[PDB]
Amino acid sequence: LRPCFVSLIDESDKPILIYVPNEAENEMNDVLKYNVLSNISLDYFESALVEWHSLDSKPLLKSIFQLEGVSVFAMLIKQTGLKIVIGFEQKSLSGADDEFEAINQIFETVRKIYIRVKCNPLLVSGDEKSIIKSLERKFDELFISTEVEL
């Protein structure tokens, strides 16, 4: 219900943003664990004969992993070479299938948010700086800041 990071990598194996929620206002330096978890999943693209992909129609939620306190996976659409991944904190994890398809559909919501901000020509040549802040500014309300809506 809350991701522990958000990571974005394009097709050249360059990480676009390894975003971590709440690194200010709360605990630091586990972001140093978070990006190397992302790099473990980056060179753990396909290894030791474990295949995540069998359906080529829509890229669904692929194989779950669990490593040293988090629960990560991958969702390779194979469309424009986008390789985005999401982990979850295992300490609050119920492990159901509506949870599993729920994180599948919120993975498609963050896919929607990236493909919306990918083609916003209100500012042009937004490719290096404050595109990142803008997409972080669109990240940080879809999973949190629901506390005052009621």
């Binding site: 360059k14 990480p15 390894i18 586990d30 972001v31 140093l32 664990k33 990006n35 190397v36 790099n39 473990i40 060179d43 753990y44 290894s47 030791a48 004969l49 474990v50 295949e51 194989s63 779950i64 669990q66 490593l67 040293e68 306190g69 904190e89 295992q90 300490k91 994890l93 492990g95």
Partner: protein, 365 residues
């Protein structure tokens, strides 16, 4: 007379859908072990990943209530007896170190067990145990001894597979705590700390920004292509590119020249802080070529010694400069005082030869 694996998966799903019992998933574990012994000599390992998913669901069944060694010790004990993934099939010329990956994940589970359950210190400085009895590590120095023996035996044994470059490109690049847990001068462990730290600089940053933070303490108070005096300056003075904060924490901006303040030999650099852009080159007084150059500024200090160059189609002309430019702001009018003209700018003089900028360590561009 037989039925295929689809009936096995559907019978496993139907045995999962059968409910209301009060066992510790022994009805699932029976069919999981039968599918495991049906899934051994296939040379496939995908059903071994399904067995890993069965181990993950068993870990979630133990992790429904497991905290503070009241039942966290029970979950770690159930995983240590669930190390029969390592103790069922273990053979050479197998399907490429899937057992080594499973033993690496089980070693992570055992490291989490030792670093949990009223434990002291931190092998990885991890704190993977959040807020919530095999007795293998009876001392804190023995906790480092029994785990660095574990994390080096299981490091390159997973590299015996097809070439993944996955764990030992990162975890054997994570040998910072292998000797700099407390021992200062890591000259013995200098094979990956201050030798090939650029493999995350050439990759995405802020991983190497802490790897280089402990790749200077092997030379901050330690003496004596492993021969240098201050020639480890690409990690010391050219670490300002990954140092995003310079105006704050300028000890990454003081020690770039304070290492050279008692220097003495040259090297190369990218000049990726101060960019340089050309302009309209004009004419000047007698035998003065005098090109026009604009230079950016992101580094702090000044008083350079530099020249520009422009090769012709045969030989370099090296259209020089005043070499006292003292670059403080962006796009400033660099003088580029140039003599020894190669035939009056003969139009094959294409500006390909670089514009270096030396402050006893050269910066080509």
């Amino acid at each position: 007379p037989f039925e295929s694996s689809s009936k096995s998966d559907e019978s496993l799903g139907s045995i999962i859908i059968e409910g209301t019992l009060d066992k510790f998933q022994l009805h699932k574990y029976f069919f999981i072990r039968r599918l495991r012994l049906l899934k051994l000599e296939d040379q496939t390992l995908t059903a071994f990943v399904g067995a890993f998913q069965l181990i993950k669901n068993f870990i979630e069944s133990i992790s429904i209530e497991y905290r503070k060694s009241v039942r966290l010790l029970e979950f770690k004990h159930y995983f240590i007896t669930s190390m029969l993934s390592y103790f069922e099939f273990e053979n050479v010329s197998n399907p490429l170190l899937c057992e080594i990956k499973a033993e690496l994940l089980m070693l992570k589970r055992d490291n989490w067990v030792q670093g949990v359950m009223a434990t002291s210190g931190y092998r990885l400085m991890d704190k993977n145990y959040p807020n919530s009895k095999e007795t293998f590590v009876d001392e804190t120095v023995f906790q480092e001894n029994f785990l660095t023996l574990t994390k080096e035996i299981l490091s390159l044994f997973n590299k015996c597979e097809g070439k993944r470059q996955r764990i030992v490109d990162i975890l054997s690049i994570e040998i910072g705590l292998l000797y700099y847990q407390g021992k200062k001068y890591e000259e013995a462990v200098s094979l990956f700390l201050s030798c090939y730290e650029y493999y995350t600089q050439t990759n995405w940053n802020s991983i190497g920004l802490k790897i280089l933070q402990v790749f200077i303490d092997s030379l901050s108070h330690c003496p004596k292509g492993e021969s240098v005096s201050a020639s480890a300056v690409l990690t010391n003075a050219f670490l300002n590119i990954l140092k995003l904060c310079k105006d704050n924490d300028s000890k990454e901006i003081w020690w770039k020249k304070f290492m050279d303040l008692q220097m003495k030999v040259h090297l190369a650099r990218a000049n990726v802080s101060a960019i340089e852009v050309n302009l309209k080159s004009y004419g000047f007084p007698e035998d003065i070529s005098t090109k026009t150059m604009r230079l950016s500024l992101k580094n702090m200090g000044g008083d350079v010694i530099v020249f520009g160059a422009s090769d012709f189609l045969l030989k370099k002309g090296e259209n020089k400069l005043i070499l006292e430019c003292r670059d403080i702001m962006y796009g400033e009018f660099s003088l580029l005082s140039f003599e020894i003209i190669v035939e009056g700018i003969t139009f094959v003089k294409e500006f390909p030869e670089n514009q270096d900028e030396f402050i006893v360590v050269p910066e080509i561009y």
